């Protein structure tokens, strides 16, 4: 798609019309568009930092900047093949955003498959309003999950209570587990209490599941009989 | 595995919409009767009920009972589902 | 009594779902369904007809890369090995 | 996130409590701390769920039928019930009980007096609930009122979670029969969630938890506390939550 | 109840695109550049069509080209070309 | 910065995977993060993803792989059955313990293997569960026999005193129709992450 | 209120209607009681209470989902300057940039509303209609949800020929006098076309630039930004992000309308 | 003064019909909680007030749906405004 001249040069085209006398009366938008000009500078702008990491895009490590011996003990005395190629496309193509937390997230759900079954609302509430002190896991607006663990790990890393990342992660995991156990106990005892004081639940979860299975089975059975009849004939 | 991307086509549409309907009951009965009359001589009473069933089937007309719209979804969603590069 | 094709046997350790009992599940299962792939040049197996015969049709034809599902280079090596085999007595 | 609502003349309440029934400390224990705690617990339970958006009453109604997630129901029930109780208490936002309300009472309790009804309520409170609970005077789809006790976080609204009597202790034959009838009714509902229709509305909630009385009245004298509450409650509020 | 062609054009432009009719009538002056007769081989037969191509322009750097076409006689095609030209007026530097 | 906010935010929180949504093989645990909406957000087709999701979907839960693909459609499946299996398991209340003599992993470079249970149960084994009728010794659960028995979102090995002919042989391969009661003995968990339950048929 | 309500007898129970009324009364007074729920997103609240252009932040835009661009494989490289980076196989739109463009767009929307121009909100996607209509109501403006018939501005006399035109004060009072048949047949062109899916209605954009009308559009990471006078970089696919931007624009135009009304009164 | 279109739907395909639907939709929204418990104008009859030649079957069916639901509001709870809006049809 070519860069369209005629979408942004509107006021100029109308100003010409007004000058001529093709237009007797000025549009409502004319003064407003004059006051607030369009961009009209549709450039490819280069980028020098990856925002997520903070790696430098533009720079090249020199031969003089690498004085000491390489892996396999060879001193770099020349530019290599890649150091001669003009790496301009890297300045312009947008950076792949990388986070240390993504790896931790991946690890957590590998270690805890059934944490995936806990449903996750992705529809954000005000991201600016929140204010979580990751001294502890249990934040108010946020629920208990692998995310909270990971945030705790990051906090530990920052504060240097656990200098190592792995140890901090383990600690966060152990904090999580206790909380989860407590949550589990809460629900069961609440259920027990309800049973004791004459509460009545019409459909339990397992009963519901059985009912759901039953309809499917009924559907299958009629179909299966028809299929057997077809096979016979 | 080996993915296969098509070029830009005029219109994604099944070439022939074979419906794949079931074969006729009357025809089947007639074939069965024919098979029976292969064996057992010309007209023995092993195929006494089969002939009657055939007659019942082919009383009002020679055959008993007398389209697949997949074009609509392909036609609709071709432009989306393309990996056609921008304008 | 009923045939095996119209009833999905859920394995012992597995999870299931209400849907999993259905005809539609069985249909879905029906729809959705080695040493050379492991990463060793097939031209070691030219004195091993037993293993090379796996990559060959009942008559003796070599199977296509669409069928066998190999890396192109690895497929061509396998083919070479097979042809070497049949040049020799063995295979 | 669920947070406690701002009561009218809050600073005055903090300074004093409630003129007759609750002290400055005793009111703080029942509301300014306990209610807050409850709200925090409810938030913790329902942080990332779909329940976060809903009000406590609506949460309770959603949850009532589910056997699991009873903790959420309990918390939601408590929060709503406690604020009803506080609303009943409040001095302003002298008012007498309404004429209509009195006529309804008369219709219900065999033409008895309001003092007699109060006395019957306090007797019920004394006898029925052991430990914690709630004491409601409710109104159902049949226009007559009746007294409804609940054993800790039992709602007056939805009869399967009335939580009206304790099966931890021994029970009567009549009570058992009533339970069986309720269960049958529940089974008759025929929905996927399995939740009956019910139109019970609370007119006078009272908080029989120890968070209200225990500071002021000690471990005994819960009956006395209940009597005091009945004597001095916001009647305008009660009148408002009476007519259809 | 109720040059002329140019006035009618101007009026039509004023309806369609809010352009000043009086300006179109007076200051703009047109000039035909090409005036073909053109045809299509239809099953019916050879179907002729009058093609015009008509520059219009106020003589103060405001100019527009326009083309128009009619199966009926060339006057209609020229009118259409004129219309097109006035729609496409353009300030040259 | 914006980058930091993005890293924090709820789409970054969902750990990425390109596992099949349709996997006809053996499913021992959840593959994908289940994602729910509220009813209000569903009503205006918003799931907190890149795009709107089709109005044909009326279920509140789903599973996805890609926010947007080359085909101009998010790769999703509207189902969250795995949560219900977990909830069923919780209801059954049979605590998972390692049959091998080992310490409970929740108490005390990276190991990708499943730490104890995958988090379907954080229940501890030592508790009893009282009721009006009394202290429940035997856990009663309804299930279906297949030929193995399907018991509340899990397949389980079964044992009995005598094989009942009247129920079985009357309908040999339609045993799935009739729901039978079960007494669940214990739940062990193997290295692959499969929950190996063991039930007992009651009559 | 409720004049046809037949109330049940005092000895009898409540009727169905009476019961419903009682429930409504309960809901109004004492249902929303136990707590108040601060810091949570209600979808409807973005349409009926959108924030002013000033008070919008990057965080709010991110919450809306405006940052989520089309895809890595569906990239129009024309839009390169707007994009921040890629993540989850998706280009992510620089949101400070988005903010500045939105503000610029909001200001021009306000200006034309102040001048008494015809603003036209174009939104062909499924869920967009209601919010679009609300925005059109907010400023005394116009909208299109059902498809844009090609040539509404270029071929106005054929398409928009047989619909009623009106007269208007310096205020917005109909001043109902009879429009002459010559007075009626002239085209009534918008002074701002504002689209929510420019990629889906290229035609409308083309018409606008031919018809000499400034235009605003939510340019996603696959859309051509040169095709419009005032592009707002952002997520056009999700319904809520669009509504947020649209609602903001409506609010900006509403303000300008209010200012115009005030100066008329003066 | 300014010459300006009447209907906010002016630029849409069938503006009059859209406007008519909008009022009914607004009413439904207003009285959406009111509990629910025939002789509607024809397609041709509706066209004369509505779109005319631009009226489509789908649009008419939608209009009917909108009217029917409004009508279904329990007669005791119904409003004067609703009945006035339905009077037309
Ligand atoms: Mg898009």
UniProtKB/Swiss-Prot annotation, chain C:
Gene Ontology biological-process entries: mitochondrial translation; translation
Record-stated family: Belongs to the bacterial ribosomal protein bS18 family.
Transmembrane portions of the chain: none
Role noted for this protein: Component of the mitochondrial ribosome (mitoribosome), a dedicated translation machinery responsible for the synthesis of mitochondrial genome-encoded proteins, including at least some of the essential transmembrane subunits of the mitochondrial respiratory chain. The mitoribosomes are attached to the mitochondrial inner membrane and translation products are cotranslationally integrated into the membrane.
Organism superkingdom: Eukaryota
Additional note from the record: Present with 1210 molecules/cell in log phase SD medium.
Subcellular location: Mitochondrion
Coiled coil feature spans: none
The gene coding this protein: RSM18
Protein name as annotated: Small ribosomal subunit protein bS18m
Molecular-function GO terms, alphabetical: small ribosomal subunit rRNA binding; structural constituent of ribosome
Species whose genome carries this gene: Saccharomyces cerevisiae (strain ATCC 204508 / S288c)
Curated annotation (Swiss-Prot), chain F:
Annotated signal peptide: none
A Gene Ontology cellular-component term: mitochondrial small ribosomal subunit
Biological process, per Gene Ontology: mitochondrial translation; mitochondrial translational initiation
Transcription recorded as keyword: no
InterPro entries: Rbsml_bS1m-like (IPR016712)
Keywords: Mitochondrion, Phosphoprotein, Ribonucleoprotein, Ribosomal protein
MF terms in GO: structural constituent of ribosome
Claim: Ribosomal protein is one of the keywords in the record: yes
Subcellular location per the Swiss-Prot or TrEMBL entry: Mitochondrion
Superkingdom of this protein's organism: Eukaryota
Pfam families: Mit_ribos_Mrp51
Remaining remarks: Present with 656 molecules/cell in log phase SD medium.
PANTHER family found in the cross-reference section: 37S RIBOSOMAL PROTEIN MRP51, MITOCHONDRIAL (PTHR28058), SMALL RIBOSOMAL SUBUNIT PROTEIN BS1M (PTHR28058:SF1)
UniProt function note: Component of the mitochondrial ribosome (mitoribosome), a dedicated translation machinery responsible for the synthesis of mitochondrial genome-encoded proteins, including at least some of the essential transmembrane subunits of the mitochondrial respiratory chain. The mitoribosomes are attached to the mitochondrial inner membrane and translation products are cotranslationally integrated into the membrane. bS1m functionally interacts with the 5'-UTR of mitochondrial mRNAs.
Subunit structure: Component of the mitochondrial small ribosomal subunit (mt-SSU). Mature yeast 74S mitochondrial ribosomes consist of a small (37S) and a large (54S) subunit. The 37S small subunit contains a 15S ribosomal RNA (15S mt-rRNA) and 34 different proteins. The 54S large subunit contains a 21S rRNA (21S mt-rRNA) and 46 different proteins.
From Swiss-Prot, chain G:
Keyword Mitochondrion assigned: yes
Subcellular location: Mitochondrion
GO BP term, example: mitochondrial translation
Main location: mitochondrion
GO cellular component: mitochondrial inner membrane; mitochondrial small ribosomal subunit; mitochondrion
Record has NADP as a keyword: no
Keywords for this protein: Mitochondrion, Ribonucleoprotein, Ribosomal protein, Transit peptide
Molecular function (Gene Ontology), one example: structural constituent of ribosome
Oligomer status and interactors: Component of the mitochondrial small ribosomal subunit (mt-SSU). Mature yeast 74S mitochondrial ribosomes consist of a small (37S) and a large (54S) subunit. The 37S small subunit contains a 15S ribosomal RNA (15S mt-rRNA) and 34 different proteins. The 54S large subunit contains a 21S rRNA (21S mt-rRNA) and 46 different proteins.
Remaining remarks: Present with 6890 molecules/cell in log phase SD medium.
Function: Component of the mitochondrial ribosome (mitoribosome), a dedicated translation machinery responsible for the synthesis of mitochondrial genome-encoded proteins, including at least some of the essential transmembrane subunits of the mitochondrial respiratory chain. The mitoribosomes are attached to the mitochondrial inner membrane and translation products are cotranslationally integrated into the membrane.
Homology family: Belongs to the universal ribosomal protein uS2 family.
Name of the featured protein: Small ribosomal subunit protein uS2m
Lineage, highest ranks first: Eukaryota, Fungi, Dikarya, Ascomycota, Saccharomycotina
Full-protein interval shown: 128 to 393 of 394
Swiss-Prot record, chain H:
Gene Ontology CC entries for this record: mitochondrial inner membrane; mitochondrial small ribosomal subunit; mitochondrion
Subcellular location: Mitochondrion
Keywords: Mitochondrion, Ribonucleoprotein, Ribosomal protein, Transit peptide
GO MF entries: RNA binding; structural constituent of ribosome
Example of a GO biological process term: mitochondrial translation
Superkingdom: Eukaryota
Major place of residence: mitochondrion
Functional note: Component of the mitochondrial ribosome (mitoribosome), a dedicated translation machinery responsible for the synthesis of mitochondrial genome-encoded proteins, including at least some of the essential transmembrane subunits of the mitochondrial respiratory chain. The mitoribosomes are attached to the mitochondrial inner membrane and translation products are cotranslationally integrated into the membrane.
Family under the similarity heading: Belongs to the universal ribosomal protein uS9 family.
Assembly description: Component of the mitochondrial small ribosomal subunit (mt-SSU). Mature yeast 74S mitochondrial ribosomes consist of a small (37S) and a large (54S) subunit. The 37S small subunit contains a 15S ribosomal RNA (15S mt-rRNA) and 34 different proteins. The 54S large subunit contains a 21S rRNA (21S mt-rRNA) and 46 different proteins.
Record protein name field: Small ribosomal subunit protein uS9m
Source organism per UniProt: Saccharomyces cerevisiae (strain ATCC 204508 / S288c)
């Amino acid at each position: 798609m070519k860069i369209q001249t005629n979408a942004v040069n509107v006021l100029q085209r109308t100003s010409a019309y007004l000058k001529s006398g093709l237009l007797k009366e000025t549009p409502a938008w004319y003064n407003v568009v004059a006051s607030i000009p369009p961009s009209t500078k549709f450039t490819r702008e280069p980028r020098f930092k990856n925002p997520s990491n903070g790696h430098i895009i533009g720079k090249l490590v020199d031969v003089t900047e690498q004085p000491h011996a390489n892996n396999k003990g060879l001193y770099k005395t020349r530019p290599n093949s890649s150091d001669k190629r003009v790496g301009v496309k890297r300045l312009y193509r947008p950076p792949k955003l990388t986070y240390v937390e993504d790896r931790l997230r991946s690890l957590f759900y590998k270690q805890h498959p059934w944490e995936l079954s806990r449903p996750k609302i992705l529809v954000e509430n005000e991201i600016g309003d929140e204010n979580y002190d990751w001294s502890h896991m249990l934040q108010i607006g946020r629920p208990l999950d692998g995310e909270s663990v990971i945030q705790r790990t990051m906090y530990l890393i920052k504060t240097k209570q656990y200098g190592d990342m792995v140890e901090a992660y383990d600690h966060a995991r152990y904090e999580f587990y206790a909380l989860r156990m407590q949550e589990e106990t809460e629900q069961q005892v609440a259920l027990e209490e309800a049973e004791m004081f004459g509460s009545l639940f019409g459909v339990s979860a397992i009963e519901h599941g059985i009912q759901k299975e039953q309809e499917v089975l009924d559907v299958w059975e009629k179909k299966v009989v028809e299929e057997t009849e077809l096979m016979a004939a | 595995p080996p993915v296969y991307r098509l070029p830009p086509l005029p219109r994604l549409k099944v070439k022939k919409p074979i419906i794949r309907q079931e074969a006729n009951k009357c025809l089947v009965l007639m074939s069965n009767l024919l098979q029976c009359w292969s064996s057992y001589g010309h007209m023995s009473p092993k195929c006494a009920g089969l002939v009657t069933e055939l007659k019942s089937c082919t009383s009002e007309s020679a055959l008993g009972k007398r389209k697949s719209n997949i074009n609509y979804h392909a036609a609709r969603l071709y432009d989306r589902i393309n990996g056609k590069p921008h304008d | 009594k009923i045939d095996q094709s119209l009833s999905k046997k859920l394995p012992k350790g597995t999870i299931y779902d209400p849907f999993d009992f259905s005809m539609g599940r069985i249909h879905l299962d029906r729809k959705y369904q080695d040493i050379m792939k492991s990463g060793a040049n097939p031209l070691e197996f030219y004195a091993r007809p037993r293993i090379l015969s796996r990559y060959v049709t009942s008559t003796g034809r070599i199977q296509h890369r669409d069928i066998t599902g190999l890396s192109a280079k690895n497929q061509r090596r396998l083919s070479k090995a097979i042809r070497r085999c049949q040049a020799i007595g063995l295979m | 996130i669920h947070v406690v609502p701002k009561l009218p003349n809050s600073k005055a309440l903090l300074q004093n409590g409630v003129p007759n029934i609750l002290s400055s400390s005793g009111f703080k224990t029942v509301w300014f701390d306990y209610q807050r705690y409850l709200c925090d617990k409810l938030t913790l339970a329902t942080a990332g769920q779909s329940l976060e958006s809903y009000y406590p009453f609506h949460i309770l109604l959603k949850t009532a039928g589910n056997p699991l997630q009873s903790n959420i129901f309990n918390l939601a029930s408590s929060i709503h019930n406690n604020h009803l109780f506080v609303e009943n208490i409040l001095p302003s936002a002298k008012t007498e009980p309404s004429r209509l309300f009195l006529s309804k009472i008369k219709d219900s309790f065999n033409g008895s007096d309001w003092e007699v009804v109060k006395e019957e309520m306090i007797y019920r409170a004394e006898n029925e609930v052991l430990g914690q609970g709630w004491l409601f005077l409710v109104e159902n789809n049949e226009k007559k009122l009746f007294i409804l006790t609940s054993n800790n976080n039992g709602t007056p609204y939805y009869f399967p979670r009335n939580q009206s009597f304790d099966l931890n202790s021994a029970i009567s034959i009549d009570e058992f029969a009533t339970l069986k009838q309720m269960k049958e009714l529940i089974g008759k509902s025929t929905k996927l969630n399995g939740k009956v229709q019910d139109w019970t509305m609370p007119i006078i909630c009272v908080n029989l938890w120890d968070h209200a009385y225990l500071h002021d009245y000690g471990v005994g004298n819960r009956s006395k506390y209940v009597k005091n509450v009945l004597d001095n409650l916001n009647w305008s509020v009660v009148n408002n939550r009476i007519f259809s | 109840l109720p040059k002329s062609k140019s006035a009618d054009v101007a009026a039509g432009l004023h309806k369609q695109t809010g352009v000043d009719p009086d300006y179109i009538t007076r200051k703009l002056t047109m000039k035909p550049l090409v005036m073909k007769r053109v045809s299509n081989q239809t099953g019916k037969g050879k179907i002729a069509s009058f093609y015009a191509l008509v520059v219009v322009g106020d003589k103060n750097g405001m100019v527009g080209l326009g083309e128009g076409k009619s199966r009926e006689e060339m006057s209609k095609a020229i009118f259409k070309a004129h219309w097109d030209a006035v729609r496409n007026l353009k300030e040259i530097p | 910065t914006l980058a930091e906010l993005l890293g924090r935010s709820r789409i970054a929180q969902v750990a990425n995977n390109h596992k099949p949504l349709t996997y006809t093989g053996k499913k021992f645990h959840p593959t994908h993060q289940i994602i729910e909406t509220k009813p209000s957000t569903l009503y205006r087709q918003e799931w907190g993803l890149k795009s709107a999701i089709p109005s044909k979907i009326k279920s509140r839960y789903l599973v996805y792989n890609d926010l947007d693909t080359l085909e101009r459609i998010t790769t999703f499946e509207p189902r969250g059955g795995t949560q219900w299996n977990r909830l069923r398991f919780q209801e059954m209340g049979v605590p998972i313990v390692s049959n091998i003599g080992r310490q409970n992993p929740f108490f005390k470079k990276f190991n990708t293997e499943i730490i104890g249970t995958g988090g379907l149960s954080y229940s501890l084994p030592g508790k009893l569960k009282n009721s009006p009728n009394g202290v429940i010794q035997r856990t009663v659960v309804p299930g279906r026999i297949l030929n193995l028995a399907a018991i509340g979102g899990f397949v389980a090995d079964v044992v009995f005193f005598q094989s009942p002919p009247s129920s079985f042989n009357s309908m040999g391969d339609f045993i799935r129709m009739k729901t039978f009661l079960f007494e669940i003995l214990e739940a062990s968990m193997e290295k692959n992450g499969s929950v190996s339950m063991h039930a007992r048929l009651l009559e | 209120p409720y004049p046809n309500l037949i109330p049940s007898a005092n000895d009898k129970p409540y009727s169905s209607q009476e019961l419903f009324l009682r429930q409504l009364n309960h809901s109004m007074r004492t249902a929303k009681l136990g707590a108040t729920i601060s810091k949570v997103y209600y979808p409807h609240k973005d349409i009926f209470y959108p924030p002013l252009p000033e008070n919008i932040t990057v965080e709010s835009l991110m919450s809306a989902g405006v940052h989520l661009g089309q895809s890595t494989s569906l990239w129009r490289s024309s839009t390169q300057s707007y994009i921040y980076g890629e993540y989850k196989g998706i280009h992510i739109i620089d949101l400070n940039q988005t903010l500045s463009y939105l503000k610029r767009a909001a200001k021009v929307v306000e200006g034309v509303s102040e001048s008494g121009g015809i603003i036209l909100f174009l939104g062909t996607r499924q869920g967009q209609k209601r919010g679009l209509e609300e925005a059109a109501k907010k400023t005394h403006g116009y909208y299109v949800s059902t498809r844009w018939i090609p040539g509404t501005l270029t071929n106005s006399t054929e398409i928009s020929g047989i619909w009623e035109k009106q007269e208007i004060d310096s205020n917005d009072n109909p001043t109902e006098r009879a429009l002459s048949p010559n007075e009626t047949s002239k085209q009534v062109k918008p002074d701002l076309l504002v689209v929510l899916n420019p990629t889906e209605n290229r035609n409308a954009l083309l018409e606008a630039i031919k018809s000499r009308v400034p235009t605003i559009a939510i340019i996603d990471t696959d859309s051509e930004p040169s095709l419009v006078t005032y592009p707002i970089p952002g997520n056009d696919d999700s319904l809520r992000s669009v509504n947020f931007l649209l609602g903001v624009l409506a609010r900006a135009g509403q303000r300008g309308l209010q200012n115009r009304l005030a100066r008329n009164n003066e | 003064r300014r010459i300006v279109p009447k209907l906010a739907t002016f630029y849409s395909a069938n503006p009059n019909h859209e406007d008519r639907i909008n009022r009914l939709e607004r009413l439904l929204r207003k009285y959406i909680k009111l509990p629910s418990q025939a002789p509607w104008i024809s397609f041709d009859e509706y066209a004369l007030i509505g779109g005319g030649t631009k009226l489509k079957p789908t649009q008419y069916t939608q209009l009917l749906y909108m009217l029917n639901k409004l009508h279904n509001i329990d007669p005791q709870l119904t409003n004067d405004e609703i009945t006035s809006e339905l009077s037309q049809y």
